[PDB]
Symmetry: C3
């Protein structure tokens, strides 16, 4: 990592100096879900280019506001390794949120469906992940440990909060959806090219249910600094294993995350 | 990436200024296939060290010429990640070729046979690939997208041209070879060490038919900029899964690629 | 790599100038096995910070001495990729040892047990490895080859010396242990976070018996320069595949390595 603890502190202090908003929840909005910021009350926007130390698709804006009675901060757009970012830059905002007093991180993305029972328009609660770049040492925690954030060797087996996963299923039932809420394992790869058929079949055989190019590094850094995490993949395509509806599902995920603010503790 | 669009343009213009040759096909010759340049008529050679912007085994020379009636440009020798090159350097010449007006890229390499039915001396048409460095984010397209070359998120599932694969099988039949033309999935790993038995068995179980240390990044960049691609692995060794003839096969691959120039469209 | 052959030479000469000890064996002590240096006779210690060119957990000290009648040099503590080291720094001392005249490298680590028949306190002879960072090109040999050390493309399938593995089993029998000596495949990943359940199940299905964050790069560089290699994992935890005793085993591994000095050739 190239940021010091004080760089994260400088940024969080700057934000605290520019808004009265004191969010307890942070939401990182992935592809096609930038529309969720429109649901916010008492909204305040900062372009990423205006926030000291922020890394330079979606808007590139941070929006504070009230969602279903809950103070939250949202990333409308995220940072991607395939854009040339190292993970220590991709995940900069996660530590900033911890230093604002955020306790819960919600992550969303759009993903390719590997599980043969998934359909375009499915929402997958993320139950677990597989971190392929992490296998090779590309990791946002690589470098000397900052103990002011967390431990040298953090556990990742409980990353996706089990109580929030229960709330998620209960809430979905309340919504009266005809399609079941999917859940499963997300695998991250670098991108930016889409996968070959041979790569897809390999990934499915590893136990992955969905494939994307983001999110995992944010979850690792969140868990390291003690945030509660839950998240969702929008299944916007079903992958080909042999040699649109995303819009309505995105709107559905927006209502869903909105309802779920009620179920986040404290 | 560290090259600008104009760097590729400067190089292509320099080449166009130094030869009357106007190739429509480019061929990257892998290990033991540097001998194919000897088949060229009206041949013109440039050492890589003489071409502005070119990255600094085989010759390290670019040879223009006519092969079986077709204008082509050949890399006698390629660049390898295990030599210390980043992929954006390994693949520099591919974009240069696009800017010369090349439409088709033929890739060749020598590989270890993972499929138990392969023998030393086999030629494998590459049907598909698995990009292991790409899983971790080592990718020649990593960085901001150059739209003058192609799209942010290119498909890779159709990388190995299906019509050329049909031509390849038909031509091989015409040659009257007693051994069948193999085809399958190539997996790239970094190298430069050869694999352990445990690594080989894992790779086979991923669905790979052959293992090598090159080629995949060239195919990705080729497809990104719209080149038609086909390629072959020379099976120069059969890998050990339990705890020479390459020379005649190389000459055979040379005749084979030579005959196939006739079947490339336009 | 950033070191020249002469950098390794400078360091080895400096060491030869500061001790009369002329070790034929080198031992790299992993997590919880720093206690083995206490068994040494005629011991001489150098903090890593005192040795020119050495990269900057355990002690960070190099200890020369006699173990069970055999001249050896020990790393009390190793260097880790997750600390921010590139492999060419992690493995610097291995080449230094070759230049001191060391012929045999013993590697030890603590690992997570993936094989369902392993228990906490097991010792696993390393029979083979899987190098995940190596699949993506993170490799200590990446860069131009130094022929004064070894070949461009070294074999890795015979990395863990078969005769030493026989000695190891015979010696363990002599010790009269009630638990069998385990043996198996070690897989390295980057860390520093521990694995998810989905990652563990994937790793087991690749054929790995134990998971850790070290060792493999040291073995690769050792084999490249011609060292005989053997090693052991201490199974200090059994990994969870569903959604302490390490101290006595560490002392046992210490006695075990001590006895085995007798069985190293010459
Ligand atoms: C919507 C979406 C996003 C991704 N990312 C990916 O790596 N592979 C896919 N197939 N998809 N699909
Ligand atoms: C001829 C050849 C080339 C390679 N490359 C590789 O990674 N593994 C092999 N076994 N072989 N064999
Ligand atoms: C003692 C130990 C060391 C490691 N390293 C690792 O990557 N995963 C584990 N589970 N463990 N356990
Ligand atoms: Mg306001
Ligand atoms: Mg001429
Ligand atoms: Mg002394």
């Amino acid at each position: 990592n190239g940021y010091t603890y004080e760089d994260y502190q400088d940024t969080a202090k700057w934000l605290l100096s520019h808004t009265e908003q004191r969010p307890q929840v942070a939401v990182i909005c992935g592809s096609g879900l930038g529309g969720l910021v429109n649901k916010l009350t008492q909204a305040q926007t900062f372009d990423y280019s205006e926030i000291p130390n922020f890394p330079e698709g979606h808007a590139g804006r941070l929006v504070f506001g009230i969602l279903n009675g809950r103070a939250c901060v949202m990333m409308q757009g995220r940072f991607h390794m395939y854009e040339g970012y190292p993970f220590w830059k991709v995940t900069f905002p996660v530590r900033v949120f911890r230093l604002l007093g955020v306790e819960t991180l919600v992550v969303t993305n759009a993903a390719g469906g590997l599980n043969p029972n998934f359909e375009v328009g499915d929402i997958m609660l993320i139950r677990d992940h597989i971190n392929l770049p992490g296998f090779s040492g590309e990791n946002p925690l690589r470098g000397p440990n900052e103990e002011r954030f967390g431990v040298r060797f953090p556990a990742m087996s409980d990353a996706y909060d089990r109580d929030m996963r229960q709330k998620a299923h209960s809430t979905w039932k309340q919504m009266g959806e005809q399609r079941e809420l999917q859940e499963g394992t997300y695998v991250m790869l670098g991108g930016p090219n889409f996968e070959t058929v041979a790569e897809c079949r390999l990934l499915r055989n590893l136990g992955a249910d969905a494939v994307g190019m983001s999110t995992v590094p944010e979850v690792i850094v969140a868990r390291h600094c003690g945030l509660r995490v839950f998240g969702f993949s929008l299944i916007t395509n079903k992958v080909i294993m042999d040699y649109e509806a995303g819009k309505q599902a995105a709107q559905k995920l927006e209502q869903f995350v909105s309802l779920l603010m009620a179920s986040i503790p404290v």
